[PDB]
Amino acid sequence: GSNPYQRGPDPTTSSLEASRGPFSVASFTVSRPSGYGAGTVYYPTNAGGKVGAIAIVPGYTARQSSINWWGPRLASHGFVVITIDTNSTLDQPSSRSSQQMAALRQVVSLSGTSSSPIYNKVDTSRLGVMGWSMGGGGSLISARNNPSLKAAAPQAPWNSSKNFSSVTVPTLIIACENDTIAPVNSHALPFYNSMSRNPKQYLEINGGSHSCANSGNSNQALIGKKGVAWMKRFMDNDTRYSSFACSNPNSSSVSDFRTENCSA
Numbered sequence: 359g360s361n362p363y364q365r366g367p368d369p370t371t372s373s374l375e376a377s378r379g380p381f382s383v384a385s386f387t388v389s390r391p392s393g394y395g396a397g398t399v400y401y402p403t404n405a406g407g408k409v410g411a412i413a414i415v416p417g418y419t420a421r422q423s424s425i426n427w428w429g430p431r432l433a434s435h436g437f438v439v440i441t442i443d444t445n446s447t448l449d450q451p452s453s454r455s456s457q458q459m460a461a462l463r464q465v466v467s468l469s470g471t472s473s474s475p476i477y478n479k480v481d482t483s484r485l486g487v488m489g490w491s492m493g494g495g496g497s498l499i500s501a502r503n504n505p506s507l508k509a510a511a512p513q514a515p516w517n518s519s520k521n522f523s524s525v526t527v528p529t530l531i532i533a534c535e536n537d538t539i540a541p542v543n544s545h546a547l548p549f550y551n552s553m554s555r556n557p558k559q560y561l562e563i564n565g566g567s568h569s570c571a572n573s574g575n576s577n578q579a580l581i582g583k584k585g586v587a588w589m590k591r592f593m594d595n596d597t598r599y600s601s602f603a604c605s606n607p608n609s610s611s612v613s614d615f616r617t618e619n620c621s622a
């Protein structure tokens with residue numbers, strides 16, 4: 359008769375393009391990271407119920423600063439977000455995947471720890487994955503290896519293997535038109551095209567370099583709208599976001615849009 363995961367007010371274009379959603383955000387540094395280098399956890403202080411959790415991994419040679427604009431942006435719409443540093447900045451995609459999953463397990467542990475900042479705030483069954491470049495490849499690996507995940511939204515992903523045909527997790531691939539590190543016809547698009555079993559989307563950012571979805575990017579209105587919408591639609595089953603998640607945004611900031619198995 360209702361959706362027990364639905365949080366917050368009805369979305370609008372304006373509300374999804376803003377710097378912050380409806381919820382207030384707080385954060386903390388993980389004191390004793392387990393299975394990864396470091397982490398910051400971002401959370402809504404006033405979501406009104408448990409929320410899903412998302413682990414976000416940087417790229418090769420990069421740190422939390424590359425991807426952490428997502429922390430406040432997603433948390434303010436009703437997600438617990440952990441942004442990590444890897445054990446080494448040189449870690450490869452499969453290692454990044456292992457560390458991403460370790461970070462999710464630690465969020466679950468923290469939600470289960472009395473007097474932690476996020477005690478009982480996480481729906482431990484509703485988890486998702488994001489990350490940049492090798493961390494984006496790692497997110498796809500995570501999805502392949504962990505079909506219980508509710509959503510994936512890698513950005514400018516890089517991976518040697520391109521065959522994600524087994525993936526059943528709803529997956530948004532954020533791509534960068536002018537990517538010359540993970541060029542789209544070698545990385546993002548083969549990954550997208552390999553997937554026949556899931557809701558999926560290809561969102562290519564017009565003029566984007568490899569770092570087009572990183573902190574400080576010039577397209578936070580569009581990219582943040584789409585990432586939040588995807589996570590709402592699939593992490594929360596929130597059908598108010600079906601339009602925003604599944605439809606072509608008709609944006610001058612998008613150079614290519616493709617989607618399948620996603621009803622608007």
